[PDB]
Design a protein around this ligand. Structure first.
Ligand SMILES: CC(C)CN(C[C@@H](O)[C@H](Cc1ccccc1)NC(=O)O[C@H]1CO[C@H]2OCC[C@H]21)S(=O)(=O)c1ccc(N)cc1
Lengths: 99, 99
């Protein structure tokens, strides 16, 4: 799809058998979700956003469906005021910005 | 232009006679710059953000050139780890996300 930016670019995701929404975020290097259970091993990571800092769990090689497209990559779990799909996974969709 | 997202989508901006770079950020509702003097009146705002809160100055009807395109809108000034161009101004460029 093509979408314009008059509203937030929110898409449906499926991860670990649960359905959520997330914002396609070209300003985010990494994908960060809050409201989700992932199984298995993970590593502590701190990420830095406008408001300071947030401490996250890094899950590697996570299967995720984004607007219908299956991909695998890194997902960070931690407090974020909005679930975010970052460029790590947008590149897998061949996403572009156009103007 | 069309750009891909393997690298951060950074563009050149000109504002208030000052040249800067900024990230094109579809996850940001508003444009937020740190490293910049604007003249005139402004209002306090809190914007929220991944690691919490930031206190910003809101400047209205600010002339800004983004990748060569002249627009006017709202610019927030305050601490941000990265200058970001939000949807308030990308809609003025007719920007779209495509996949
Ligand atoms: C500030 C950016 C360089 C970085 N961020 C992405 C950014 O798109 C966030 C993404 C975002 C979105 C909603 C809430 C928190 C963070 N948007 C944001 O801070 O925008 C603010 C300015 O406009 C307002 O509208 C949204 C909040 C305000 S971030 O959230 O800090 C971030 C940083 C690193 C990663 N991996 C993922 C996210």
């Amino acid at each position: 799809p093509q979408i314009t930016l008059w509203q937030r670019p929110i898409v449906t995701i499926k991860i670990g058998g649960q359905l959520r929404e997330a914002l396609l975020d070209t300003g985010a290097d990494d994908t960060v979700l809050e409201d989700i259970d992932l199984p298995g091993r993970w590593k502590p990571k701190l990420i830095v956003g406008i408001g300071g800092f947030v401490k996250v769990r890094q899950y590697e090689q996570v299967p995720i469906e984004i607007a219908g497209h299956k991909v695998v990559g890194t997902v960070l779990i931690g407090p974020t005021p909005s679930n975010i799909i970052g460029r790590n996974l947008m590149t897998q969709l061949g996403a572009t910005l156009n103007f």
